[model samples]
Structure formats: C-alpha cells, structure tokens
Target: HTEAETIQKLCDRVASSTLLDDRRNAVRALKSLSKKYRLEVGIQAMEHLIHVLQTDRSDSEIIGYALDTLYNIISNDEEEEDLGSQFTEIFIKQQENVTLLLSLLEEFDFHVRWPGVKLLTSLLKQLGPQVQQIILVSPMGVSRLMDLLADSREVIRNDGVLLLQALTRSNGAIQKIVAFENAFERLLDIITEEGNSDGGIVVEDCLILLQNLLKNNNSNQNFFKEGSYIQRMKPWFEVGDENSGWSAQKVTNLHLMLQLVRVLVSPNNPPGATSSCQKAMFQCGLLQQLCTILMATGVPADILTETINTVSEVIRGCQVNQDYFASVNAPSNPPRPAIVVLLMSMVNERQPFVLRCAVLYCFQCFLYKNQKGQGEIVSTLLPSTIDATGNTVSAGQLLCGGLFSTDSLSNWCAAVALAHALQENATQKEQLLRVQLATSIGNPPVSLLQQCTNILSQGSKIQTRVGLLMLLCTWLSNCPIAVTHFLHNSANVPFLTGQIAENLGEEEQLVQGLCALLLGISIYFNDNSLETYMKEKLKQLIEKRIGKENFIEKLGFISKHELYSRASQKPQPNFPSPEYMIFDHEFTKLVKELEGVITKAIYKSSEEDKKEEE
Candidate 1:
C-alpha cells in the first residue's frame, strides 16, 4: 500500500477496530509511520491513539500506550508550548475519557484496566517531579489513583499501586500527598478485604503495593500508633456472614488480615505504632482456626496453606510475635491454646514448606520462653495435622492434592521456608549453648561459628548455602560468640570473605544488599584483638581494592576475594582521636559499599541459587 493509503487505513483502523488486536496493531503501525515524518504525522497518530484510548473501546493497554505516546510527545521544554497546551487540553477537557478511565476502579474484568494501568505507570515515569507533585496533590488525581486500589480487577490495582509508588518515589511529595489525603486507612482497609477474599489473585497485587508502601523509609511509621491509621481499620477486619459480609471461607481474607498485622509490627515496619483492632477471633474461642486448618481435616488444603503463610508472616516480625503471643497466652484464655498446638503439628508435616515455616515460627517463640508447652504444642497436634480420614492414602500422596498443585509461588515460599528451617535446626544446639552462656555470665561462647562452618563447608544445597550465609551474617552481627568464631575460623576465612567480595563485584543491587549485610556482620569481628587470621583476610581483601581503586578494579577484587580481608586496607593518617575517626570512616565506607553490592546481588544470586538447588 502507498504511504497516504496506509495512513488512511491506519486511521480507519484506530477509529473502527473492533478487536483489541486490531487496535494494538493500528497503534503500532501508526507509531512506526510517525518515526518517518517525525512531526505533524507523529502528533496526529498520537492524537488518534489517545482518542481511541478515550473512546468506548479503551481498555487498560490501549490507554497505557496512549498515555505513553502523549508523554513522549511533550516530554521536553523545547516542545512547542502550543503543542503541550493542546495535549493537556485533550486529556483534561475530555470528561468522557477521564470519567471512563476512572470508572475502571470498579471494573470487574481483570484485563480491562491493564492498559490504563500501564499508561498511568508510563505517565508517572516520564512526568517531571513538578508534574508528579501536581498529579499527586491535585484533588481528583490522587482519588483516581486510589480508585485503582479498590478496583475489582487485580491487574488494575497492581498498576495503580505501582504508579503511586513511582509518583511517591519523591519522599517530600509522597509525604505531602499521604498527609493531604490521609490515605493509609482507606488503602489498608481495601487491602485487608482483598487479602481475605475467596479469589487469591487480588491479594497478591495488594500485598505487592503494601510491601512497597511499607518498605519506603519515608513511609508513615506512626500510622500504627494508638488511634492512628492502623487502629482506625480494626472494625473492618471482623468476620461477618457471607450473605451480608465480604467472605467467610476465603482464606485470602484472613491472610490479608494477618499481613496487615505483620506490617504494623514487622522489623522493617516503622516502629512506635500498634494495632487496636479487637481480637474477636480469639475472643470468640476460635483461636483454633489455625489449629483446625493444620489438622487438615474438613478444611481445604489451599486454605490451610494460606493460613500457614499468614501466620508465618506475622511471626517473622518481632513486634507481632510479642503482641500475638501475649494475646493468645492469656491466663484466662480458652483451653485450646490453639497457636501452640498448631505449631507442634506442623513439625512433622510432609510438605517441607509447612514443616519448615511452622517449626521456625514456633521456635521464634520457643527460644524466648524455652518451655515444654512449646514441644507439646507440636506433639499434641501431630497426629491430626495430616489427613486422618484418608486412611489408605500415604502422607506424601495426600499432600499432592491442592488447587495450586503446580504453583511456583507456593514453591518459592516453601523453598525459602525450608532453607530457613534447616539453618535454624543446624545451629540450634550450638546457639542454645551460646544463649545459655550469655544469660549466666556476660559473654556467650560463639557456638554458631562451627555450625555455620559445617553448613558452608558442605555447599550441599544452594538454598542451604544461601540460608547459612544469611544466618551466619546475622549471628556475626548480633552475637559476640559468632563474631569471635568468625575472627578465628581459618578454613572459612577465605571462602566466607571471598563470597562477600565477589558479591560486591556483581554490582547487582541485590548482591550489594546481601554483601552489605555480610560486611556489617564482619564489622563485629573488628576489635583491638581482631584475630591475626581475620586481619590477614581483611588485609588481603582491602589491599586488592580500596581507596584509589577504579570502579571495575574494586568490582574484580571483590568478586575474587568473596570474603573480608584487611590486607587490601589503605592506611589512614593519624590525628587526635585517630582510632575513633579511622574506625568510624572505615565502617561507614564499608557499609555503604557493601550495601550497594548486596542490593544488586540478591535477586540474581537468589535466582541462581534456586536453580542450582532445584
């Protein structure tokens, strides 16, 4: 077809295409055509895309592209002011476009808002900080974004949250926007509801958003305080009759509720806040919800899995652990002591995920209290946690039945949980001795040192390796014994420090983050008596790459060493309080560099580790 003819057909297609594929193709062709003409034709094509997106035919994808095209057209100060004014007019003046897209908040079709969500994300990404501020604070702008959260479609909510995250990436703007709308309560309410809903899909999206929101350092930590945002949502968590209420049997709802609890009290959560939500579930003598589910009797396996996940999430956070256990362990509490018994049952479960998570969480509590009540909690429920009625079926076969039989997400959860449990169990006896010593005297013998050494030496499972690495890092940072062990270990000095340095070389954010964690742990080993072996390793690492080193050189040395060493160290000039100044600067610089590498390394290394283990 001739150029003019092609343009005409493309125009017609944009106007009259019935199916989504046709519209998408027309937009693509027009986009291609615009590249040649580069001015008026490009503008016309973009206008058409926006028009189509605004029209009744608009879905999330089409709207998203249209938004992208519009953003591209007007991204620069050099763009004609006339064109920019016209572009804004096209979107702002078109009530049909704006209102129609806004209506997508309540859209039931999961696919409908995907395009629009994509569009919103692109727009936020391209928009300058000023424009981002405008969009967030503008009365209708934030409301529309919030609509995405409550939208019935999972994709839309995900997109909306993602867009909000981008816009709020500016700490100042996010704070202002959050303060302006007082949005935490409403979003939390929606999240709680969605999480507990029968369909688990939306819950994942909501959790992603929640994770982003809570992860931000500028996030509202005080939102969990008494009479604060979290407290305000308490009434909404109540279980109601399905006929009149949101849901009864859907475990996602419960999962979401538990997640909310976790976020309010998680280690990563901003402290100085608490949840005021009444514990009607406990009050009503239904503490057995988790216990009953673990019994795996009448309940569906999927629901049981969800319950375990929820409980595990809650347990991971220290704050929630303290609060939840206190509530469930009340002296006048009902006879069930369901939380205790439920955990006991999980220890023997065939599903490694459940077995691991349950054991780890129970141990978190058990370690603090050190009671046989904890053991009984597991022992009493052990018999029934498996499928009792299915008498002829083996436990392994029974475990295979599920809604998400091939669920990769569940598998990921299970894999991580198993890794954590194995690490804990491997170090349990040693760690116990250290804990005892620390309590009786002032100092604890470094028990985890040998335990970690054993685990890392095997290099058996990649998951096990990663888990041990993380655990060792934790022990080194927090326990004196672990630090002492780290300083003394001759065999692991090269390997442990080598991995840390290699992590820095990768420059992947995740790698840097994990490496930083390892580095922080190594810092605990640094003292006046820093062992000769440890100093040698640290020196070797330092001399290989430190001050005056190029970025690539440092990266190489780090990858090579994969462990800490002082040999690579650059000497600091002596001055008043020189030791303090040198140590402070060294620790600070090491932390910043290590943090950068670990951040880069985590996902890639995790992926690599997972594949290797599998």
Candidate 2:
C-alpha cells in the first residue's frame, strides 16, 4: 500500500479494532508515524490516540498504548514548528488531555501509572508555567503526583519528586500550592527514611525539594519548624568515628543535608521569625555540628564551601551565635583550635574560588564579635616565615600572589579578612604594619605594599580594588606608622592619588575611600608642600572632568546621616568605631581645603589672562 493508504489503515485500526493485539500494534505504529511525519501524521495520530483513551473502556493496555503514543508524539515533536504549536494548542484547548493523564496515574498497574506520570512530567517540563498551572489545578493532577511519591517503585518515586521540585522552583504560586498540599511532610518523610537508599539520589532530590520549599516562604518555614524536622535531620550531620558504620552513601547524604540546612538557616529567612529559627538552630547544637563537619578531613570542596557558608549565615545577624562562639575557647588536644584548624586548612589547601571566599567570610563573622577567638583566628591567617629566606609573608600575600592573580577573588577575601583582623585591636594593627614593614636589613623588600599595589593596579573588578583601597585607607588613618611608611614611599602617594582620580566617577564608597586615604596623607604627614601638591593634582583633575563647583556641590549634597548608609550596607571590616564617619569627616575636610586653593588659582589665572589681553 502507498504511504498515505498505509497511514489511513493504521488510523482505522487504532480507532476501530476489536482485538487488543491489533489495537496496540496500530497505536504503536501511529506513534512511529508521528515520530517521522510529526506535522502531518502526528496531529492525526494524537487525535486518534485521545479518541482511544476516551472511548476504549474495555482494555487499559489500549489506553496505556495510546498514552504512550501521545507521549511519544508530543515529546518527539516538541521542537517542531508546526506539530509543536498544534500539539500545544490542541492539548491546552482540550482540558481532557490533562484530566486523562492525571486519571491514568490512579491506575493500579505500575506499567500503566508509570507511563502516565512520565508523560505528565514531560508535559510539565516542555510546557510553560501556564500549562503547568493548568495541570496542577486540574482534578487529581497534584494528588496523583503526590500519590506517586509514595509509589513502591524507585523510578516512579524519583520522577514524582523531581517533577514536584521543578514545579515548585521559581514559581511562587506553585510553591504555595505544593506546600498547601502538605508536600513538605511527604518530602521530609522520604528524606528521613530513604536518605541512604538508591545510592542517595532520591534523598538528594528530596533535600533539594525541601530547600526550595522553605525558601522565602514564612508559612513553609513555620511548617518546617513545627515538626521534628531539625531532629530528624540531625543525624545526617554526624560524620561518625572510625568503625561508626557510616557508609560512603551515608556521607553523601550528610553532605546533602548540610546544603539543606544552609538554606533553612539562611540570613534571608522570612523576616519576622528569622531570629527564632536561628535561635532554634543553635539550641539544637547546629553550630557545634557545623564546626565538627569543618574539622573533618577529605571533605569535598563543594561540601566544605556550603558548610562554611552555612556557618556564616547561621551566625550572621544573630548575636547569640556570635556570643556563643566567642565564649568557646580553642581546643588544646587537636594541636590547634577546631575552628582555627578548619580555617587554616582551607587557607593552605587547594580549594575553589567560592570555597576560599566562604572560608574568609566565616573568619570575618567569627572575628566580628568574638574577641576571644580573634587572636587564634588572626594567628592562623598570619603568614609564616620561609625557613630558607628568613623573610616574613602573610597568608593574603601567598594565596593571592601570582602573575595573573592581581584580581583574584582569594585576594579580596584574604584582604577583607586581614583588614578585619587588624581592626580588632590597636596591637593587632601595629603587628600587621610590623610584618608588612619588616625585611632583611639589605634587601628592604616591600611585602604588603607591593601586594596592595598589584591588586590596586591590575585588579579588574571595581569591587576588589575598592575593598583593598578601603582597607588601606582605614589602616593609614588608624595607624600613624602606616602613614609614615606611605609618605616614605613616593611611588605609593602618586599611585594612590591616580587611583582616586581615575575612579572618582565610580561608586560613592570607592570615591569616599580614596578621598579618606588622601586626607590621611595630608593630615598625618604635616607637610604643606606635599599636601598642596596632592590638592593641586586633585583640583586639576576635578576641574578637567567633573567641574570643581559640581564636585563641591556633590560633596555638599551628602548628608551626615546619608554618609552612614554605605557603612550599613556591608559593615566596614574596621573595628573600634564606624570608619565611614571618620572617612566622611576627612573627605569633607579635604574638599573644603581644596576648594579654597582652587578658588585662588582660578582668580590668579583669570587676572593673568586679563593683563595679557590689556
């Protein structure tokens, strides 16, 4: 028979055949035709398949075949222009397509229900959120998927959980619907019971799903808090002693649970109850468990990164956690404090950029409030001397130095951490200067200054450069000796001045930092010639680009209260006092000083021009 004739016969058999064998054969044949001639034969096949599903009550095998064929047609032709649009329009217009698929999910046969759920998942993935919303709202759609979550078969459970995860992600409305359906309870149950099963993939999916569910949803957060969720998840955090019966899969589950806990105790938790949740987390020994995880060896970089991030988030904005960490002393048995050991290992060990940043951030938080931990944390971060060279180096210099690493993120983290450490006490600040300024008698090498210059010159990212400048400026103002060093090094002054001039148009914080450093140079040195020269350079640059009047007006526009806004965004690593106000005062003072010089220069130049004309 011709192809058209063959197609017509297949359609006839699919619609009219009495025997199950013939009907199944015809439906499978139609599926094949739809796969090839998706535009022409696919639409016809889908119509026939839907007809079979609606009309064939005697044999579910025929229904299964029909659903399978429809799945094949829609999924295979998903990218086809003609058939794709037609399939969407047809299925969306005909609500029965979704209703039928959902109904088949309730079928007793695994073979039948599995295909139905699979097809529904495919549709949800391919179709947009509108279609997903439609299907989710349809009768038995969500209930069937939830029912499949409890399916005895592993594949069915996996697919159902994944579909629920996909639906809930980035779709707040769907998240609410899933949470309303009590999906969290089922998901938590799956995680609690099946965490070590199926090589831990199912458990991983469940944990991810739970993370999504709890994100930014107060009701769900409250839901998670109501039950023994934290208690059930607690065991996964323990990396038992040797012969403690922890399998590799169990360790994998433990890693996944850390990620989930990170999401749960995030600083961005729903506003009103964030403190309550953080307090609860501490009450359950969450902080100690995280520290233990950090102390473990051979942990994956990604897991370590997340663990550090979780520690940071848990302690952030929660004074209780910070105070708790402050009160806990370093352990003596381990040869170093547990927290210090974990952080030092990260600094010395090879890790990804994110992990390095997170490690530093953890240190930042720990030292922010914990005066007791400051000495230990700073000691670990301080660079040790090379045995052969007898020269001192810093952890920041070693980790962040390279030909192309001027802008390395590790440098930013190390800089911020070091800056925070120095800010902890005057003694620490002086100690940092002593190290940076120290050198073998004849060599006279510059360590920290050279590193800072490299970062300031080659650091491509504005944020990194800005952060370095902020740290340097704070050091200069706070440490009079640093100002002395900066003055002795003529290259440093021009470099600092040029950087400020270049980035004047950048963010307010950076410009403010540059100005503060300049003021420190002028005020601390007590050299009018040096101060006049620096002010002259700034004046010329300001007039050439942003006119002095405009610059002065901009400075005037900055309110005293507004000056503190930037500091509030990310608390300055500088300690003892808010550095922003001091910077603000210095910047304002410098502008006024420069304003007088510029006015005189303009008047003198104008008079000279008039005399020449006369």
Candidate 3:
C-alpha cells in the first residue's frame, strides 16, 4: 500500500476499533506517522481522535490514548506554523471535547486524570483568551482543579497548580479565579499543608498562584491581609538549629518561604495594610528570626541576599516597623540589639562583597532615627573621629570600598548604601560630615572627600562617577560645612556643571542626581552669582533641546495638583521636637521658593518672546 493508504488504514482502525489493544496500537502508530508527516497525519488523526473523544464516553483507555495521540500531533513542530489554532477551532466546534477533558480530570483513577490535565495544560497555552474563558467558565473547569489541588497525590496537585497558573495569566482571568468561592482558600491551604516533606516546587507554585491572584486585586489583597496567612507561614521560615542538621531541600523551602513574604510586601501589593501586616509580622517574631538568619555562619550567598531583601521590604515605608526593628534588644551573652549587632558583624566580617553591601543597606535602614542605635552602629562598625584622619582608615575603607574596589556590583551597592546612611537622618549626616571634614583638616593624608574627588576626577564607569556625585550631593545637602568646603574648591563646581550639561540628554536619573548636586550647592552657598550660573546653564540646555517657546508651553501643561504635591508629606513624629518643626518649616519654604522661581522663569520667557515678535 502507498503511504497515504497506510495512513488511512491506521486512522480508520483508530477511529473504529472495538478492541482496546487494537485501538491503542492504531493510535500509537498514528502518533509516529504524525511526527514524520505531521500535516497529513495530524489532519486525518485529529479528526478521528476528536470523534472518538466525543463518541466514546465510557472507554477510559481508548480516550486516554486518543488524547495522548492528539497531544503528540499538535505539539510544536520544526516549521513552527501554529497547528494549535487549527486544533483549537476543531475542539471549539465539538465543545463536548472540552467537557470530556474536564470530566476526565474528575475521574476516580490517576491514569485518567493525568493525561487529561496534561492535555488541557498544553491546550490552554495555545488557545486564545476567548477560548480559554470558555474552558474555565465551564461548570467543572475551575472547581475540578480545586479538587485536584487537594488530591492525595503530589503529582496531581502539582499539575493542577500549573494549569491554574496558566489559566490565571491575564487580569480578567485572575479576577474570575480570585472571585471563585474556594479557589483562594484552597491555595492557602496547599501552601501551608505538610503533606509531602519534599514539596518545595508544589508549594512555590501555590505561592506564585497566590501572588497572581492578589496582584492588582484589591479585594483579594484585603482578604489576605485580614486573614492569618502570613502568621501561618512563620513555621516554614524556621529551618531549625544549625547544629541539629539541615538538608538542601530544607534550605530551598525556607528560601521559597521568604520569597513569598517578599512578594506579599512588594510595591504591587495592596496598599493600606502595611502597618497592620508589619505589626503582625513583628508580633510573630519574624523580624528577629530574619536577623538570626543573617547572622548564621556558612549561609549561601543567594539565601543571604533574599533574606536581606525580605527584611528591607518588611520595614520599608512603615516608620512603626522601622522603629520596632531598630529597637530589638537581643539578650545574648554580650548585650546588643538584634539588627545593630548583626549588621555590624556582617560588615566587619570577611565575606562576599555582595553580601556586605546588602548588610550595609539594612544597616542604613536601622540608622534612620534611633540615636542610641546610631551611636551603637557607628561605634561598632565605623572608625572613631580621632582615627579617621589617616593615610588609610578602617571605617573609610569598609564603607567606601566600592569607590575603589574592582567589582562593579560591589561598587553600585556600597555607594548607594553609603549615600543612604549619610542622607537618611540629620544626625547621621552631621556625624559623617564632621568626621570627613576633620580628617581633611587634620594631619592624616587620605580624607573621605579626597577619595570622592579622586573618583569624580578619574573614574571610568558612568555608574562610579554618578555614585560619587550622589554621595557628595547628599552630604552637601545636609551639612553647611561640607557645602562650604566643596564650593571653596576650584575644580569641583566646573566639573559638576560640565557633567550636568553633557548629560542633559542622557538618563533622567543621572541628570536628576547631577541637578540635585548643583541645586544643593546653589542653595547652601546662597551665592547669587553661583545660582545665576546654574540657571544660565539650564536655560541654555532648554533652548538647545526644546525651543524656549515650546518649553514655556510645555511648562503650562503640568497640572496644579502635581506641582503642589510633588513633595511628599512628612510623617508626623509621635513627639515633635522644636528643632524638627523648624526643619520642616524651612523645607516647606524652600519648596515654595523653588516653585515660584520656576513659574517666574516660564512666564518671563513668554513675555520676552512676545516682545521680540512685536
């Protein structure tokens, strides 16, 4: 017989064979032929298999074989022409096949549901949103998967979670699933259930599914916030004592658990519950546990990074949590606070540069407002003011090593953390500036300002240059003494102004940082000549990039509210000091003056343009 005739014979047998063995064999042969001559066999075999799936409702074995054969034919081919849409249309025409697949998922035996869920997972990936909606909206579609998530077998639960993830890939589908009665609750149960000791992947999948469900879904996020889900996840974060024993799987699960926490507190998370959720986290002692994890010896670098990021997210934007974290007084043999001592030890120890940078970032957060905490951190991690004026200082080397280190990641992270610590509070800024200035004036040769100046003068990478400028701008902004010293130097001002002009058309962030440096200088010096020089440079750039007329019109396009609320409202402290109130008043005055100057410049340019035209 010819090849076409041989293929026709197998298709006929696969479609009509009463014997199970004969049908399975025929389907298997057609699967092989579909691989070689996909177009011919796929077209013929798909028709026959769909017919069998629609007609033979009771025969589980043949139905499974038919689904498996269809899977092979419709799977990806070298030509990459989409055979999925063609098959999808055929299945949509015979909508019973969709129902049949869902029915098989609910079958008593694993053999029946296994092939069915696999085929459905593949099919959903290929189908369009409309077709996917059809499958999921069916009576047995979502509810069946929920049942499978609670199944006795791990494989079944894993596949079910994967299929649900695929189904909820879009915002509309996510809203639907999140609205479903038992879907969210079942996922939470799966995440916390202790069925299989080696269920890392399964639990991770459930966590991802929950993230999608909560992402942008305010109602679902509120549900999670009100529920005790985060509280229940605490046990997973504990990996037991180090001397007891630990396995790779245990470590992996712990990492996944922390990642789940990070996702919960991410910027995309539902707003308005930061304080409540953080309060619960503190009540459960999770922050203390995280500090212990950071302090543990021989932890993996990746785990350490994840743990540090998790801590950062938890305390970020919540002053209450920040205060609570900084005030954690651990009662070990040697008395010390949890965050302070751990950060000090981590920065001082010889470790990976990336880990050291993460520790520094966390340390910066700890130093936000606690003066006692700040004193302890400086005393323990940094060098004294007396010892800072040397050719080489230990504290300067530890904090600013990124400026001199060869590692680019280390350079970026360390620079950012150093800037944050100095600029985060008035006290820290004063302490750092006083030490740096004292060193510059004293007998010791290498000063912090000198290191910054060297990098600014000779650094190769754009990031390195930007990092140094950021540190300088931050220090100058907070300290009048630093500003005076910086302005007194002949080379610094011209170098900064030139860079600001050169990078005008470059990245907005770099330009903004440079502008900030220039603004800080102008504000501190209170020098009209300097301010005029800065404004003239900006006007030149504006004229070159966008014509003055066009710039003036664009300035009008900005809304009143945006201009008014550009500066965020400072969170009112529990106990407002007279000095703090004065600072706030001055800060508000500066914002208003800046706004006035910008408004005046635009209208003044308009007036000049009108005069020239006349």
Off by over 4 Å in 3: 13-39, 75-96, 109-111, 128-131, 153-155, 171-180, 184-201, 215-217, 243-251, 328-350, 364-415, 422-436, 439-464, 475-614
- TM-scores, one per candidate: 0.40, 0.67, 0.70
- CA lDDT, candidate 3, residue 166: 70
> What lDDT score is found at residue 242 in candidate 2?
41
Cα lDDT tens digits, model 3, 65-149, are 7777776665552344467667666666766677777877778676668777777777776774754677666875665566777
Model 1 segments more than 4 A misplaced: 1-42, 45-122, 125-172, 185-213, 217-219, 228-257, 270-349, 365-614
- Candidate 2: give the clashing pairs: none
- Counted clashes in each candidate structure: 59, 0, 0
Ranking by TM-score, best first?
Answer: 3, 2, 1
For residues 1-614, could you state the per-residue lDDT of candidate 1 as single tens digits? Answer: 47666776787888877887888777766655553444454445655765665574535565555544544454333333344444544444444544444455344545455655554454455543644655544447655566565665555666676667666665455544544464566565665665435435555444444544554333454433332454433443444323333244455555655555455544333333322222323333223344334444445454455455444433432333434543453122333343434333343335545444444344343222323322332222223455544333321121212101243222222222222322323243233323210124665444334544554555333333433444445445434445555656566555544554453433332333343355444542444255564423453454454321322243343334323233124211112321111111122244444544433332233356447335
- Looking at model 2, residue 202 earns an lDDT score of 78
Q: Best to worst by lDDT, what's the order?
A: 2, 3, 1
How does each model score on lDDT?
Answer: 0.44, 0.59, 0.58
TM-score of 1: 0.40
Clashing pairs in 3: none
lDDT, model 1: 0.44
- With candidate 2 superimposed using the best TM-score fit, by how many Å does residue 590's alpha carbon deviate from the native? 19
